[PDB]
């Protein structure tokens, strides 16, 4: 099935329970049986219309004998309608097959801009490159003062302004928004 | 994005990333290829007489007809990159051949001179002049080629 | 420098061409600017420096010919635009409001009829952001917007 399978609008059997938007995503943060994908640069909610347009715009410019695309986010289940929570760093749609990144860059960027939250078209190589250069940034920054250091040491009494979650987010994640430039 | 507390904004500004600054700008600081190599090396011994022209102003059909009239004889027409032909001259020890091949160049490798009839054919098209060649390690200009033909 | 002369018969003669001055302070550099130690030490008004990269009618010379860096070619081009608009090259012309440090071509900017509020003021650009890394001889940074 080298195509994005149709997803149900709502689950047949509702589930009781098991902010899912703020902070980095913990699951589906790494490629699994794919080579390209769409990465969420910020949290948000995916609607059924959003999913349907993902599937449409991916399966339109699709080569089933050379491209296979899979979801990484489940069907809309959270009641509000039904939506899916997505956190920053979460892959949305993965692709694989005998293909090159520029072959998909165009419409992947288009569909990422379509997405309600900030999103990016990321290959395995680009994901590794951005992770490595983020590590390089945090290792070579010439600023003696970092959000992590100041918040942990409660310098200037700054925890009176900050949140308890800021100690773990180290200033990179502020609410649902994610700031990759923030070292 | 909702407005942060001003103290938090000051914290973010002070903790903004500072890239390392190099003192001196690094910028302002200091198998088809081998197939062509071997084929041209073999051709340099296969051919006995060689000539070059500028067969680029011709149309597709005119070039096809010229190729047919050349294949009527045992002569074979060749095109090869100057980018790779320049090393070939020094590899085959052809020093006088350096100021001969630049831009478009079409070789006319042969062993039996039908250059009389080839010049006769070229005459009816008053362009595409003959360019100097080098038969059996002996350079011949256009006048030398004409004398050899006669 | 080759020049074409007509009489019709036309021919090109190579004439006298100036050479780089002897003893560069920093030989073996990328650009002439790096060779002569001028990375951040020239401005729009340094006509003696700027005119050395200028066609006789005022146009810039190509980067390939000049040997300048990409960034230095951009800086020289913008500085030459500013010098021309300030009237510092009266002889390098194709054939009355005094200005200087003009970033934009005078006929292409629109009047600021509604300058915004204090927190969103529409400022008038001055100079070029390309020269932001120049040598700073002042306590306060020189402002690019007024």
């Amino acid at each position: 099935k080298p195509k994005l399978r149709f997803i149900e609008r709502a689950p047949l059997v509702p589930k009781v329970r098991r902010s899912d938007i703020r902070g980095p995503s913990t699951e589906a943060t790494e490629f699994t049986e794919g080579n390209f994908a769409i990465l969420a640069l910020g949290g948000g909610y995916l609607h059924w219309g959003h999913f349907e347009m993902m599937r449409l715009t991916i399966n339109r410019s699709m080569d089933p004998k050379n491209m296979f695309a899979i979801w990484r986010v489940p069907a809309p289940f959270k009641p509000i309608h039904y939506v899916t929570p997505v956190k920053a760093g979460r892959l949305v749609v993965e692709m694989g097959g005998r293909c090159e990144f520029e072959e998909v860059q165009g419409f992947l960027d288009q569909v990422a801009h379509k997405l309600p939250f900030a999103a990016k078209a990321v290959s395995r190589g680009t994901l590794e490159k951005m992770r490595k250069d983020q590590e390089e940034r945090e290792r070579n920054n010439q600023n003696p003062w970092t959000f992590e250091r100041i918040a942990t040491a409660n310098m200037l009494g700054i925890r009176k302004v900050l949140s308890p979650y800021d100690l773990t987010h180290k200033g990179k994640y502020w609410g649902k928004f994610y700031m990759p430039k923030r070292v | 994005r909702r407005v942060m507390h001003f103290q938090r904004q000051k914290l973010m500004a002070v903790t903004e990333y500072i890239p390392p600054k190099p003192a001196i700008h690094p910028s302002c600081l200091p198998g088809l290829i081998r197939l062509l190599r071997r084929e041209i090396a073999a051709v340099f011994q296969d051919n006995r007489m060689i000539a070059v022209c500028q067969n680029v102003a011709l149309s597709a059909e005119d070039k096809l007809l010229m190729r047919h009239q050349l294949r009527k004889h045992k002569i074979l027409m060749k095109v090869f990159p100057n980018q790779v032909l320049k090393p070939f001259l020094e590899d085959s020890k052809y020093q006088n051949l350096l100021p001969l091949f630049v831009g478009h160049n079409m070789l006319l490798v042969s062993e039996e001179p039908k250059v009389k009839e080839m010049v006769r054919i070229l005459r009816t098209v008053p362009f595409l002049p003959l360019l100097g060649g080098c038969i059996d390690d002996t350079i011949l200009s256009r006048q030398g080629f004409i004398n050899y033909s006669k | 420098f080759r020049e074409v002369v007509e009489t019709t018969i036309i021919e090109g003669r190579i004439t006298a061409t100036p050479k780089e001055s002897p003893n560069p302070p920093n030989p073996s550099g990328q650009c002439p600017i790096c060779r002569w130690n001028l990375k951040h030490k020239y401005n729009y008004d340094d006509v003696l420096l700027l005119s050395q990269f200028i066609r006789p009618h005022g146009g810039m010379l190509p980067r390939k010919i000049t040997g300048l860096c990409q960034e230095e070619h951009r800086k020289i081009e913008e500085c030459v635009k500013m010098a021309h608009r300030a009237g510092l090259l009266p002889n390098h012309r194709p054939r009355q409001l005094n200005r200087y440090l003009t970033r934009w071509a005078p006929g292409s900017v629109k009047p600021i009829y509604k300058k915004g509020p204090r927190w969103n003021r529409v400022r008038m650009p001055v100079g070029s952001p390309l020269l932001r890394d120049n040598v700073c001889y002042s306590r306060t940074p020189w402002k690019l917007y007024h």
Partner: peptide, 29 residues
């Protein structure tokens, strides 16, 4: 209305942070 951080404000905060870092050092022994 939005507010912005000036170089003077950043320098003041940095001065305070330096004092606090020295406090850390002198409290470490």
């Amino acid at each position: 209305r939005p507010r912005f951080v000036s170089l003077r404000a950043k320098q003041n905060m940095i001065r305070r942070l330096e004092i606090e870092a020295e406090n850390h050092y002198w409290l470490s022994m």
